[PDB]
Amino acid sequence: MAQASVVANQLIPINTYLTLVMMRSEVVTPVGIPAEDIPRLVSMQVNRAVPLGTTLMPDMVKGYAA
Predict the structure, then answer these.
(1) In sequence order, what are the beta bridge partners of 24?
(2) Are 54 and 46 in contact (CB under 8 A)?
(3) How many domains does the chain have?
(4) CA of 18: how far to CAs of 2, 24, 25, 29, in Å?
(5) Pairing state of beta strands 23-26 and 45-46?
(6) In this structure, what CATH number is given to the domain that contains residue 25?
(7) Residue 41: CB partners within 8 Å, gap ≥ 6?
(8) Which UniProt keywords apply?
(9) CB 43: neighbour CB atoms within 10 A?
(10) Structural domain boundaries, residue 26
(11) Is the CB of residue 24 less than 8 Å from the CB of residue 4?
């Protein structure tokens, strides 16, 4: 397991536009959005509440496509 994913560094309320302070990189299982993509997630909106420590998955971000 060496791929790092984007993990919520704080609670992200439903419909928040993502900022850099909200996303950390962590090696977690299952794998979500690759950590390498944090730059392009800024200003994209989540479509559900993301609790602290939750892995961000592609389906939780509106407009995300990798």
Answers:
(1) 7
(2) no
(3) 1
(4) 25, 12, 14, 22
(5) unpaired
(6) 3.90.1210.10
(7) 6, 18, 23, 33, 56, 61, 64
(8) Antifreeze protein, Secreted
(9) 9
(10) 1-66
(11) no
